[PDB]
Amino acid sequence: GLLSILRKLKSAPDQEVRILLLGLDNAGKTTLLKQLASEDISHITPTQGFNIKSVQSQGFKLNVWDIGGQRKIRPYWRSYFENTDILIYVIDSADRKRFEETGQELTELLEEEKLSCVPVLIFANKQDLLTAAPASEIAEGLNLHTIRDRVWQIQSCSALTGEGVQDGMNWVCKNV
Ligand SMILES: Nc1nc2c(ncn2[C@@H]2O[C@H](COP(=O)(O)OP(=O)(O)O)[C@@H](O)[C@H]2O)c(=O)[nH]1
Ligand SMILES: [N+]
């Protein structure tokens, strides 16, 4: 007893919500996953180099994996895009060196036909760090305001402390 966020959620959806939690390695996805659900994590490997962490919790199905990396594993990623209801993209706000890379990865994801119209929540993570870049600047750097083909939101959070995570999930629940 020391409750996960998916459970605390008020006005939670009615149908099972399929969520994809993506971002670069070290972004804080596993840490975020554990703040969201306490259920046991399943580790699935559809193809070599494609490592998925999957959890079923509180009417939510979450699949988590690191983006970027190898070329030939895109067709395997795409199979999951088709039935995705929400995309949660996680960024390490203190990793300026890889901001350009993660921005490009996000841009490419939003170009995927299979992800058309899927709402996207961007978590500007690790905001507890005194090295974390400002969320308003991250948003401009990701050119989020140019997004016209879907609804989006950027939320400052700390998966470590849990701050801002529920606020982000509240937005997700309003846009399912
Ligand atoms: N200070 C701080 N560290 C975090 C936060 N979220 C994750 N981390 C740390 O970042 C590292 C990578 O996190 P992890 O969840 O395993 O990343 P994943 O590779 O994206 O699954 C670990 O050392 C975490 O403890 C945060 O909000 N604040
Ligand atoms: N801008």
Swiss-Prot record:
Protein name in UniProt? ADP-ribosylation factor-like protein 3
* Major location category of this protein: Golgi
Q: What gene name is given for the protein in this entry?
A: Arl3
Describe the task this protein carries out: Small GTP-binding protein which cycles between an inactive GDP-bound and an active GTP-bound form, and the rate of cycling is regulated by guanine nucleotide exchange factors (GEF) and GTPase-activating proteins (GAP). Required for normal cytokinesis and cilia signaling. Required for targeting proteins to the cilium, including myristoylated NPHP3 and prenylated INPP5E. Targets NPHP3 to the ciliary membrane by releasing myristoylated NPHP3 from UNC119B cargo adapter into the cilium.
**Its GO biological process terms?**
cilium assembly; Golgi to plasma membrane transport; intraciliary transport; kidney development; mitotic cytokinesis; photoreceptor cell development; post-Golgi vesicle-mediated transport; protein localization to ciliary membrane
CDD domains registered for this protein in UniProt: Arl3 (cd04155)
Q: Which organism is it from?
A: Mus musculus (Mouse)
Taxonomic lineage from the root: Eukaryota, Metazoa, Chordata, Craniata, Vertebrata
Q: Name one molecular function that GO assigns to this entry.
A: GDP binding
Which keywords belong to this entry? Cell cycle, Cell division, Cell projection, Cytoplasm, Cytoskeleton, Golgi apparatus, GTP-binding, Lipoprotein, Magnesium, Membrane, Metal-binding, Myristate, Nucleotide-binding, Nucleus, Phosphoprotein, Protein transport, Transport
The knockout note for this entry states: Lethality by 3 weeks of age. Mice exhibit abnormal development of renal, hepatic, and pancreatic epithelial tubule structures. Mice show abnormal epithelial cell proliferation and cyst formation. Moreover, they exhibit photoreceptor degeneration as early as postnatal day 14.
